[PDB]
């Protein structure tokens, strides 16, 4: 079981919207009850998705109402995190954690343009 990231590094503009990608292999119909997905960065929980249901009560303050997972695309083996209105605090190492059968994690480094 290997989770794959198409991009090692995002460089984003201040105030933009971004969508970072995580691929994980699915075979032919997602078994939602077996899927576990966490998006975090380095003490902070962004997404908690365990055995088919989300729990945002775990989400950190920084990302409140701003970052969300896109659920229809889970069918495609795609776990995409969607960060709205990026700022310089969102810069940092992000990490995807996916368990479906086996489990793996990948890191992605993010840089945010100064204004202008």
């Amino acid at each position, epitope marked *: 079981f290997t989770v794959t990231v198409p991009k090692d590094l995002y460089v984003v503009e201040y105030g933009s919207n971004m969508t970072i990608e995580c691929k994980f292999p699915v075979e032919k119909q997602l078994d939602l009850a077996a899927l576990i997905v966490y998006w975090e960065m380095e003490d902070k929980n962004i997404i908690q998705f365990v055995h088919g249901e989300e729990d945002l009560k775990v989400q950190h303050s920084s990302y409140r109402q701003r970052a969300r997972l896109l659920k229809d695309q889970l069918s495609l083996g795609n776990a995409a995190l969607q960060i709205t209105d990026v700022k310089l605090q969102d810069a940092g190492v992000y990490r995807c954690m996916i*368990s479906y059968g086996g489990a793996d994690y990948k890191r992605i480094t993010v840089k945010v343009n100064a204004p202008y």
Partner: antibody
Amino acid sequence: GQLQESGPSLVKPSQTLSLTCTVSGDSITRGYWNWIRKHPGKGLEYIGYISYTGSTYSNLSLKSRVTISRDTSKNQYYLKLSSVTAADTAVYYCATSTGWLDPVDYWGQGTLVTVSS
Amino acid sequence: DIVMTQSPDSLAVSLGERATINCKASQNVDTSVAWFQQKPGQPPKALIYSASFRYSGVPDRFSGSGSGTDFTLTISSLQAEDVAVYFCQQYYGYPFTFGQGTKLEIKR
């Protein structure tokens, strides 16, 4: 470090089992704080964890009835298991692991909890 | 879940001899397997992780092996103090699961 579980030894059926694990030593900073139980005549069952990020995981076999939480200001984390039955009589272990994909490598002594009228 | 089936349920070995405890995964785990020892009235004690490498302090006679789905703990030069229940854990995927354990008895 050193983990020490506490709470009632007896809980009536249909109530909620509440337990506490007091975390000391090196384990305070370990990344994942787990709960494990062992029903008599059955293998060990992994219950779930709470992470240094505040994130939780719970076994699908139990997810409905389980709530894991923490209080870092007291160096504790808790387990609440609702609507308990005789199947939930078990020795309940708290335990730590270094990472998200590492073995459960330090165990507490475990505490027996019986469900009975 | 990934079911971890241990074999045997129990074994009796003489002192100084060798005991073999198998743990079989229901799907590829490739080496995310740990071994534990639990002496009576004591908490489990980590022996091996990544399925052949010992933890610090664990004596030399405890050797783990295997990869894929077949894993084996070998205890050589068996000592009286080796009486315990030995069990495996997989951390390849969630939920983590354990073998049901093998009870090692000393023959004398």
